[PDB]
Curated annotation (Swiss-Prot), chains A, B:
SUPFAM superfamilies, alphabetized: AF2331-like
Protein name, as recorded: Uncharacterized protein AF_2331
InterPro entries: AF2331-like_dom, AF2331-like_sf
Length: 93, 93
């Protein structure tokens, strides 16, 4: 799995500004259909990840499945600062 | 299932601003572990949904699984206007 990307509010605005192509719209889903944690071994011992799954209707796309797969997408979580570890604090952009 | 939320760039930015109120950071993940289209059935026929699962490391949190479950989160997708259906175009804010 990928590293953690934690953003200050301003760096999160910058990140968006950088990633928003001129002619795009943003489809937003808060429809979480599953959420859980799983472990995986790495070359540096066992780790834990959260998995959050979101649903959203396909009827808004005139696009096939692999096209929607290819589209730039992100999950975002709003986390109060009291709820970070030391590691989560070290990571803040 | 919730209806689709589709925002123009400016509406999308206004929407997120409303969440950046407190001592809050934003955890962002593009680590899609699973992506597919699946049919959903009801009494009045079938509808296709996309499902997007994202992973993010747990060790950044000082929080159990139910607490991460409870935090505000969204999947967002960046879509070319020329890739929307007529209904998707319809629903822009």
């Amino acid at each position: 799995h990928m590293p953690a990307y934690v953003f200050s509010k301003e760096s999160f605005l910058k990140f968006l500004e950088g990633h928003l192509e001129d002619d795009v719209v943003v489809v937003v889903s808060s429809d979480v259909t599953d959420f859980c944690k799983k472990l995986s071994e790495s070359m540096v011992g066992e780790k834990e990840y959260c998995f959050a799954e979101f649903a959203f209707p396909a009827d808004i796309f005139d696009a096939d499945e692999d096209e929607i797969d290819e589209m730039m997408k992100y999950a975002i979580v709003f986390v109060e600062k009291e709820k970070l570890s030391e590691a989560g604090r070290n990571a803040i952009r």
